[PDB]
């Protein structure tokens, strides 16, 4: 499965100018394009080499789409003040995420097209891609308007058409980058705590794709809530990073072992304090 998703944000700032507007596009867990109204040059920009192969028509077209969206969101921020009857001097946020998850074989799995206002669900297109779920009173007003206007129909056309077709194109043109495999490097580090015991930290870095399994075992038994497992996140070079730590008794670290599983490894990697 693969995905093409766009994360959009509009943040008003009364007294500081027009709302800040941003768009970030991702193929799976990798950003490849972005738009920021506050950038040195406010237009669509590549964020990965493989997308740079797209001609000028692509950048001017996406730039136009982004600026058109920006105007739409400016209007939406004003309307929202009215729906919620809020003061006109405060800052507010409108968020939107749309995209498609496609089956291992160019078959659409799920479509997304949802909004949030001031960090809370506002309205979202249901899985049938034909109906809307409004989270509150105000969103109910938007829903009625979109049903009468036929918004879903056009939105679905994007998800089932453009979103799917372009993702296929992106996966092909960016194959060397998007479908590559960078093996993880792993380490275990040893820090004595002030309380007298020891914190063992298992590192996993420089890997791609993001999916990875990192765990601590005690006497060959996987630990769960007893260890601290942070979520994996990106590094600056397009790879990912993760780590897990466990507090163990001073003198008993030979009993703890860290396990790493990743498609970039030929077999699970087991490490110990060293």
């Amino acid at each position: 499965s693969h995905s093409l998703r766009y994360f959009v944000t509009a943040v008003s700032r009364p007294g500081f100018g027009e709302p800040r507007y941003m768009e970030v596009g991702y193929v799976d867990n990798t950003e490849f394009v972005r738009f920021d109204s506050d950038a040195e040059n406010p237009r669509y920009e590549p964020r990965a080499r493989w997308i740079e192969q797209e001609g000028p028509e692509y950048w001017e077209r996406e730039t136009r789409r982004a600026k058109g969206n920006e105007q739409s969101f400016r209007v939406d921020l004003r309307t929202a003040l009215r729906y919620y009857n809020q003061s006109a001097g405060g800052s507010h946020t409108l968020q939107w995420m749309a995209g498609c998850d496609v089956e291992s074989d160019g078959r659409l799995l799920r479509g997304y097209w949802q909004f949030a206002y001031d960090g809370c669900d506002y309205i979202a297109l249901n899985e049938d891609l034909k109906t809307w779920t409004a989270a509150d009173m105000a969103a109910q007003i938007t829903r009625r308007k979109w049903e009468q206007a036929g918004a879903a129909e056009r939105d679905r056309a994007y998800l089932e058409g453009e979103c799917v077709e372009w993702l296929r194109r992106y996966l092909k043109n960016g194959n060397a980058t998007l479908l590559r495999t960078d093996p993880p490097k792993a380490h275990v580090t040893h820090h004595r705590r002030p309380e007298g015991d020891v914190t063992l930290r298992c590192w996993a870095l420089g890997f791609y794709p993001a999916d990875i399994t990192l765990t601590w075992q005690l006497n060959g038994e996987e630990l769960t809530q007893e260890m601290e497992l942070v979520e994996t996140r990106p590094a600056r070079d397009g790879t990912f990073q993760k780590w897990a730590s466990v507090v163990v008794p001073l003198g008993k670290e030979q009993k703890y072992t860290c396990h790493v599983e990743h498609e970039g490894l030929p077999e699970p990697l087991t490490l110990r304090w060293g």
Binding site: Y6, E23, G25, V33, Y58, R61, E62, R65, A66, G68, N69, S72, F73, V75, D76, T79, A80, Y83, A98, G99, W113, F115, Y122, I123, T142, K145, W146, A149, A151, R154, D155, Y158, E162, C163, W166
Partner: peptide, 10 residues
């Protein structure tokens, strides 16, 4: 390519 709000405002 990305999604378009078109003219469907909230």
């Amino acid at each position: 390519i990305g999604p378009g709000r078109a003219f469907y405002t909230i």
